[PDB]
Design an enzyme around this catalytic site. Structure first.
Site, PDB file in Angstrom:
ATOM      1  N   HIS A  82       0.815  -1.212   0.000  1.00  0.00           N
ATOM      2  CA  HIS A  82       0.000   0.000   0.000  1.00  0.00           C
ATOM      3  C   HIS A  82       0.850   1.263   0.000  1.00  0.00           C
ATOM      4  O   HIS A  82       0.292   2.361  -0.151  1.00  0.00           O
ATOM      5  CB  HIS A  82      -1.025  -0.057   1.154  1.00  0.00           C
ATOM      6  N   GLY A 124       4.993   0.256   5.979  1.00  0.00           N
ATOM      7  CA  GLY A 124       6.071  -0.327   5.195  1.00  0.00           C
ATOM      8  C   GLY A 124       7.347  -0.573   5.972  1.00  0.00           C
ATOM      9  O   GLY A 124       8.240  -1.276   5.469  1.00  0.00           O
TER      10      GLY A 124
HETATM   11  N1  LIG Z   1      -1.342   0.492  13.045  1.00  0.00           N
HETATM   12  C1  LIG Z   1      -1.598   1.436  12.112  1.00  0.00           C
HETATM   13  C2  LIG Z   1      -0.874   1.481  10.899  1.00  0.00           C
HETATM   14  C3  LIG Z   1      -1.172   2.470   9.987  1.00  0.00           C
HETATM   15  C4  LIG Z   1      -2.174   3.397  10.248  1.00  0.00           C
HETATM   16  C5  LIG Z   1      -2.536   4.475   9.258  1.00  0.00           C
HETATM   17  N2  LIG Z   1      -3.190   3.931   8.075  1.00  0.00           N
HETATM   18  C6  LIG Z   1      -4.443   3.481   8.103  1.00  0.00           C
HETATM   19  O1  LIG Z   1      -5.186   3.612   9.072  1.00  0.00           O
HETATM   20  C7  LIG Z   1      -4.914   2.746   6.851  1.00  0.00           C
HETATM   21  C8  LIG Z   1      -4.456   1.283   6.877  1.00  0.00           C
HETATM   22  C9  LIG Z   1      -3.100   1.331   6.191  1.00  0.00           C
HETATM   23  C10 LIG Z   1      -3.316   2.324   5.061  1.00  0.00           C
HETATM   24  N3  LIG Z   1      -4.286   3.271   5.634  1.00  0.00           N
HETATM   25  C11 LIG Z   1      -4.672   4.456   5.133  1.00  0.00           C
HETATM   26  O2  LIG Z   1      -5.476   5.164   5.716  1.00  0.00           O
HETATM   27  C12 LIG Z   1      -4.116   4.884   3.786  1.00  0.00           C
HETATM   28  N4  LIG Z   1      -3.713   6.295   3.838  1.00  0.00           N
HETATM   29  C13 LIG Z   1      -4.999   4.581   2.570  1.00  0.00           C
HETATM   30  C14 LIG Z   1      -5.328   3.111   2.448  1.00  0.00           C
HETATM   31  C15 LIG Z   1      -6.346   2.549   3.208  1.00  0.00           C
HETATM   32  C16 LIG Z   1      -6.607   1.191   3.144  1.00  0.00           C
HETATM   33  C17 LIG Z   1      -5.870   0.383   2.306  1.00  0.00           C
HETATM   34  C18 LIG Z   1      -4.868   0.933   1.534  1.00  0.00           C
HETATM   35  C19 LIG Z   1      -4.592   2.288   1.612  1.00  0.00           C
HETATM   36  C20 LIG Z   1      -2.841   3.278  11.456  1.00  0.00           C
HETATM   37  N5  LIG Z   1      -2.575   2.341  12.378  1.00  0.00           N
END
Ligand SMILES: Nc1ccc(CNC(=O)[C@@H]2CCCN2C(=O)[C@H](N)Cc2ccccc2)cn1
Ligand SMILES: [Ca+2]
Length: 223
Positions: free
Chosen positions: A40, A178
């Site tokens: 992602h 990542g």
């Molecule tokens: N423990 C954690 C790790 C990471 C985070 C912050 N990120 C997120 O909450 C979500 C999941 C990971 C990706 N993400 C996003 O919001 C993306 N900006 C867009 C996206 C969303 C979903 C799938 C792909 C891409 C929070 N807590």
């Protein structure tokens, strides 16, 4: 990283920053030519930044190397985040040294309760926003499959595991994605997702790298 500590400059020498004019994701150097990160985190035009501590200041141990190719896992599903893993090849090999070093891949998956080191330049607040300039670290245990799946019913695949604290307060967060989860000297996880950050009964979810060693080895051997 929420609830963590300042690592110390170059104390996590396999940690890289992915830069597209600005830091946007972490990654892990796995040999002089290759970085592993989250699917992602994919975008075109990545510059890999090795040897970083303060990502806003040139401190003298950095290597900036453009990616020549990115390979997202063939089964990556952005709807479920299953198989959230990607390989990035460096245009030129990194010059390995005490501050720029690779991390070993696991030969086997790790037990619940194993202590791990999670690191990154992501948000340090569980409510609101504050980004650090130096690398932050968190010591966190692998949680049981059943604790993980109880926190996230219907959402945890065999290619995911949870690490952290069900009481909340300590976690990875936005901007850490990542980056590495290292346990007993092995890259066991990649920062993948969770429900917010450091929320109670919502630990971070990590890509289960031990399931991908065959794919990593085969892909780098042919690319
Ligand atoms: N423990 C954690 C790790 C990471 C985070 C912050 N990120 C997120 O909450 C979500 C999941 C990971 C990706 N993400 C996003 O919001 C993306 N900006 C867009 C996206 C969303 C979903 C799938 C792909 C891409 C929070 N807590
Ligand atoms: Ca720097």
């Amino acid at each position: 990283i929420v609830g963590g500590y300042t690592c110390g400059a170059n104390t996590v020498p396999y940690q890289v920053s992915l830069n597209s004019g600005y830091h946007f994701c972490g990654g892990s150097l796995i040999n002089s030519q290759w970085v592993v990160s989250a699917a992602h985190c994919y975008k075109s035009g990545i510059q890999v930044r090795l040897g970083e501590d303060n990502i806003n200041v040139v401190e003298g141990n950095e290597q900036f190397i453009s990616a020549s190719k990115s390979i997202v896992h063939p089964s990556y599903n952005s709807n479920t985040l299953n198989n959230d893993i990607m390989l990035i090849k460096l245009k030129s090999a990194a010059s390995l040294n005490s501050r720029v070093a690779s991390i070993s891949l696991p030969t086997s998956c790790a037990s619940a309760g194993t202590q791990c080191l999670i690191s990154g330049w992501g948000n340090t607040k569980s409510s609101g926003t504050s980004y650090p300039d130096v690398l932050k670290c968190l010591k966190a245990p692998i949680l049981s499959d059943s604790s993980c799946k109880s926190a996230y019913p219907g959402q945890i695949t065999s290619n995911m595991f949870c690490a952290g604290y069900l009481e909340g307060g300590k976690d990875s967060c936005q901007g850490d994605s990542g980056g590495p989860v290292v346990c007993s000297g092995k890259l066991q996880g990649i920062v993948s997702w969770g429900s917010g950050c450091a929320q109670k009964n919502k630990p971070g979810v990590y890509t289960k790298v031990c399931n991908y060693v065959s794919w990593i080895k085969q892909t780098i051997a042919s690319n």
